[PDB]
Symmetry: D2
Subunit: 509 residues, 4 copies
């Protein structure tokens, strides 16, 4: 798991890996020159007793006031302490890891004027699997994610706390595990740490990875449902999608053709396989899942760029000798990317729920009502369908956009903000909702196919069936339903179906 980072070149697949599992990283040697050059430029500005806002200038009245080196050193600590004003649930370690790596990535490009040694400290925490406490809420994604990044930065100073092996350690305990001792920040370093969009970006990246996972599961589940109700393959005909010209849809049908094949034992099992027209939940899968693929591709485009962005402030341009203040802390693009992903995740679940609904209806599924025999006496999947409906509906309200709101802070200087952290975070729960729907679709279609005694579907959809049946049995007589849904959900969360989808379809896969 050893990543040698060339700053600014992380790929979405690399980000997914960093999000998914611990990492051992090292900065590429070629990053050192620009990083050290940046610090040298700050050191010269101060050595020449020059005044540079964000570098050695104070605040408010002192904003046009050079600062005594002792006080400059002190100002750093005070900024981090006061800015660590976040609240709510701790982030989990995988997400904290991602955030730390994005900050390392950005700092290591050499425009922030921070000492290499502080970057090395963050790298050491990551390699040691020591994860600073970071509370979920507080950032508005403008100037940066000041509070969550400040909470992160506390551990560096020997403040706050960090998790190691699932247990909270004091910063000193935690630093020691990393082979570190508390740091003392210099000019510009507090700002270099607290400014930026890494929390916002990390929140949205997890939303993306979830959206991708659910896309991949939905193609396999949708394939099984088609098979379970003896659906047609004609909706996936390449000529249909070429004639439309929508690329998400073209690629989506291609995926369906890949998992389903030209036919199967089960589909060959009935004289007529298309005779009657299929419902839209089946027949329009390429169009709807195609619209979702494009959506998440559009988001991923924006987020993969932001993961490599230089997002602090002000920026140090050592090549010019320049220090400049811009607005890259404003995470507006991130906020809209998260609101875009919301549409994708919601509609993936909505279509799956209608496929479940379809399999529940005797007049449409060519299956026993509620997917069970002895129907007078058994309810079978009846309430599972209800749970799917509850989950799906939830996503309509959750899809309301956060990127359209803003409140001015600090006497109207921060007078427009992105609300990107909120946008990204709601995607995690929408993904839980859509994950439960798909898990119930999975259960339904596999039950259904079982009822077409001994008949098999395609090679990849048989693997999908086998993966489920490894944990949950055919539903005979009524039994406690919930645990089956729990197991299906966990399987999906573990990416059990992801490997079935053709590679290079999804942005980070």
């Amino acid at each position: 798991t050893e990543l040698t980072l060339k700053p600014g070149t992380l790929t979405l697949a690399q980000l997914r890996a960093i999000h998914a599992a611990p990492v051992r990283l090292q900065l590429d040697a070629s990053a050192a020159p620009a990083i050290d050059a940046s610090v040298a430029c700050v050191e010269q500005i101060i050595a020449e007793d020059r005044t540079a806002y964000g570098i050695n200038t104070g605040f408010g009245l002192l904003a046009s006031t050079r600062i005594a080196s002792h006080d400059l050193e002190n100002l750093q600590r005070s900024l981090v302490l006061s800015h660590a004003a976040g609240i709510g649930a701790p982030l989990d370690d995988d997400l904290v890891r991602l955030i730390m790596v994005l900050k390392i990535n950005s700092l290591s490009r050499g425009f922030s004027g921070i000492r290499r040694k502080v970057i090395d400290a963050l790298i050491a925490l990551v390699n040691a699997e020591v994860y600073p406490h970071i509370p979920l809420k507080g950032s508005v994604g403008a100037s940066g994610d000041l509070a969550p990044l400040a909470h992160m930065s506390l551990v560096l100073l020997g403040e706050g706390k960090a998790r190691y092996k699932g247990q909270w350690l004091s910063a000193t305990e935690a630093l020691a595990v990393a082979g570190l001792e508390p740091l003392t920040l210099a000019a510009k370093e507090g700002l270099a740490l607290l400014n930026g969009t890494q929390a916002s970006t990390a929140y949205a990246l997890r939303g993306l990875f979830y959206a991708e996972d659910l896309y991949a599961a939905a193609i396999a589940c949708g394939g099984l449902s088609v098979e379970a109700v003896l659906g047609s393959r004609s909706p996936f005909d390449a000529r249909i999608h070429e004639a439309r010209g929508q690329r998400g849809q073209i690629d989506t049908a291609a995926c369906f053709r890949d998992l389903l094949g030209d036919s199967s034992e089960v589909s060959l099992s009935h004289k007529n396989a298309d005779k009657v027209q299929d419902p839209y939940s089946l027949r329009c899968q390429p169009q709807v899942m195609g619209a979702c693929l494009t959506q998440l591709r559009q988001a991923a485009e924006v987020l993969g760029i932001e993961a490599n962005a230089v997002s602090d402030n002000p920026l140090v341009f050592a090549a010019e000798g320049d220090v400049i203040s811009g607005g890259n802390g404003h995470a507006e693009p991130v906020a809209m990317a998260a609101d875009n992903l919301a549409l994708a995740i919601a509609e993936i679940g909505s279509l799956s729920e209608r496929r479940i609904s379809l399999m529940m209806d005797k007049h449409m599924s060519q299956l026993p009502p509620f997917l069970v025999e002895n129907g007078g006496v058994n309810s079978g999947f009846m309430i599972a369908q209800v749970t799917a409906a509850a989950l799906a509906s939830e996503n309509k309200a959750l899809s309301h956009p956060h990127s359209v709101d803003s409140l001015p802070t600090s006497a109207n200087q921060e007078d427009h903000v992105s609300m990107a952290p909120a946008a990204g975070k709601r995607l995690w729960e929408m993904a839980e909702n859509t994950r439960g729907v798909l898990a119930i679709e999975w259960l339904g279609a596999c039950q259904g196919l079982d009822l077409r005694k001994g008949l098999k579907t395609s090679a990849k959809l048989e693997k999908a069936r086998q993966a489920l049946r490894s944990e949950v049995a055919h539903y005979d007589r009524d039994r406690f339903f919930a645990p089956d849904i729990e197991k299906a959900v966990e399987l999906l969360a573990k990416g059990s179906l992801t490997g079935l989808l053709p590679a290079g379809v999804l942005p980070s896969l």
Copy 2:
């Protein structure tokens, strides 16, 4: 502390108490007649070989078919098992208790035809402080809260699991704690347990109780903020509110006058107290908070009725010998009550946030910028304000209504539902958001008052100052900020400020 329950007569204050703390209850002697008559009618139907859907009919083709009663018993168990298809986090014990008591309340009115012994089993679990596991999601609040209620009912059967003294026990161990053994259900009892609106109702009642808590706190917090910035008392003059005629606003201004009084040491400290106009976030508090009061009163009224409703189906009318199938499981009124509460919770937070923003602006507060001295190098409350902004903004999307959505379930027999569980559960997080804003407002105004060296506000507001300062000190120089927010939040959560509000203002207080 012993509740002697006359079914159908629980008050909002009793409901708050059950939600807040354990309960010991017993049915009033006057309850037996209706209960016994109800069961007798069901027994008579079955004895008279009569057919009654929901009593002794099977399902589907058997909807119009009497069932071999021995099969009838099994049907009850199959219903509970298959209907227990809920998903998500376990509800906490306080909410399970409330749900159980609501179901006891309803069944004990004598329209459900259930055996007293089954009510008694539930009463024993409550009194033994044994709380069946109930998953958060699944119900759409139409037919009833089938999934959460079935999970609850599993324990009665010796299935599922229950929490005791904070630990999960097997159903049989749990039952034994309560002095019970597994039950065998009889005719209509499965449906009597599963149908109804008790989960939805419980969810929205927790939402009301939080909304009331936050209202009370906001009156005190807003009172401190007025004093901190040397605001006027003129906006609260009773003649202003009488001339408008809105009762929420009239009662709200009366509370403000109660807590602030006609003047205080602090207010008498400045020559002019009204000369200049105060901003709307001050001047319009009775108008905005009064609107919120009304909204939560409108909701309280609906939920207080629903807490005493007979909500299962079909209903047994012993007096006429009738069993009738209706739609009382449809929780539409609860769903709209919860969406109504959302507006209150959001606007209480929005107004507090603007009061916070006011306190940060030197040109508005007559206080040091960001409420701290040594401004050159100290940020003070600067990021806490941002956090307040993030929390409040979140509430805008969260207030999108759930009561306006619906999906047809079970082959379109259940073709319209309420989505009340979703509506009420989101209030809990909205309340965390607003609670956070108010904690920061509380922190700001006490800080700000502190800077008016040695001056006191009114008798009640000084107690509010006292409560906080017992956990969180005055902010001198920048320090780790978040722990102070945590502490103020917890204080608020514990109802530290609720007692300051005058009697008989809030529905359940």
Copy 3:
């Protein structure tokens, strides 16, 4: 139509009539003393050279500075002219009248310090049916409906324009139609006219009247649909609704029983009336429409009061000789009331849409597919149903609440506002959507009942059938569909079915 106004006592029924048609009004003689005393108190303040903000002070630098009387009058003009900065479509005459009468109503209570003669001028425009141009957008309902009330007030000054007999006139031409000459305003008079919540309130009252109209039509439409698909009357049994205890639902089922009766020739046409269970869209009509009724009642309570409110600023209390600045211009209660009404109008239409969907499904309706004979070649109501689905869906997004948003204006002086105008005006379009759905249900049910050859429904529902068939014939063979829907909508808009409803059920009826 002569209304003799006793200010502050208008009823919801009186407000409906004013909204519905031209009015001829006059002030009750008993109102003169308080109005005249209010003016004298202002004149005394001015004469005693006392300084009163809102009365004789300028603005900003002059806000606490008396102004030369010559300027005092000029100030009045500049306020109206500068404040008339609204935009968008002209309000129609009915709404302009409502707003005018509301401002007459509030001014006439004698707390505003305005000359009776200006009130008289307004009354004169109303009675002459001369309606000032007022643009739709601009107000945020905080301080008042400043822009729309400024536009209205222009005409009093001989500025702006007014509609008479459907044509725009110059203000001078317009004034002369009303027997008036351009007015010159005195101290406090500009604020008295522009401050207040009359535009917000008028917008929300029209939404209420619409919601009410749609409620009544939905009871009759719901009743026809029950008859068309041979649904049961049992869901309306009074005992069911009594047992729940919700007053809206109790009253709603009373209405259904009123129009349906115990039975009908059609209902008696089919052996079984309860055998099979009705779909929720039928069976839960009392529960859903009852929730809607409660909502619109809760809204009505708040708006009927606001219609009688004294909402300008500052307020003059001649009895004490006091002038007070308060926040009555903040229309938060009206904004929440409108957001509440949104839930009602949306859910009335959602339930209707589902009933339409039921009538289209041969497996549920017991009617030919799509309600026409010769289905192999006729599409019948197939696309009309789609149109109803489009209309219902729109209302989900339109139901997003406006009362949860705010932007600070006037340098954070007006730092919290209500957005009530936006909240109320969207209700008109939501009503248009729900009216379309109901129109299509009406057409559907009458068609379906026609197919029950010669069978009659109840006496009031046959009246419903007759009202439609007088304009729209039975659908034999496919024909241009749209003109049918247009006619049904227009019929509903004109209240063709409102008279069927029992009196005293809806707030203004």
Copy 4:
């Protein structure tokens, strides 16, 4: 204006031109072979008495049943008549034009099996500027825009009505104007006309064009606002945006640099140009407007493809001799493109409002309060600002996604739909809101720059001042404000500032 249409190759710039103004078009000679082959494939299927769904089968019972050719002509008429079930206001002529051209473009690709004469008829109507009546609402954008396209198609049959020179004519008169006589449709032709996404796509393309128009105006307005308050040009430094890597932001800052230049007479007027820090509303224009550019680009990509799509059903593949039923009538990609455009239009307006708020604040603008001198008695821009706040706030609710909603229609065969028409049409009003805000910003910045006596801004920004000042004078003393806003809005609407923006930035420009 003579377009020679090569089917499937329309560019966004061509689509803009078609939306903006009348067109004379002709089919390229290259289109005939495929058009003719498709028809011939259809005619041969019928001549061989083979059975083809959507070609020669009836409906319902006849779903698998050929039709007597005479009846086949009748079935086409019945389809158009019954499907013309739309409702609401008439679309404007420009939009009807765009729809007709899109339908011609699609049919002309030769996959629909429609006679060239039917295409020629639509082309004739377009060339004659005869515009069939089409009602705004009814379509759910799945199967197609059946209702609006049927309404359009009526005229072809000698039914319905059409607008010519602003007047409604009967279909036959309209047809005569185009040199036509009523047509009789052949097999599959009704479906070929009614199926597809042309209405959906036309509605969203107008939103895109509006969004673009407002982007362009916003750069010029934002530029004037920077100059008016003496803002810095440093935020636009290319190195800042290069370091982030976002292309939308890069292109946007480039645009700001183009319009502003390195400096101006006004900017050189003040010693310091960056000294003081600018608010986010200024400083973060590249970041926020860049995110908006990206959003509309992502939508334009999808819509550009969709304007050229083959979207009816079923499709005729003459090459193979195949007729296939697919889901291209499902307009999901268009629904999401519209919801995406909503975020852009909202945030452009939001940023514009905050710049207006900045300009009103004397502590922030370095200009007189409310942009007027003699402030004691003049209110100046004070209420214009409130109007902008109202408009901007409206867009938050309107931004709620429509693409996340769906209802099953037509007996559960159309069980998932896109709601693309609603999604696109809400953009038109959101653009009116944002246009109003930008108009007010324009007025304010020019007012303000005027107050920097005699000083000029950049070459392009002076043209912007000139454009406005040609219709609206400097604001001296308070005056009727609204007409100035109307005039500014009209100027913007006519594209007055669009030409200032560098070429190659916006998708259709």
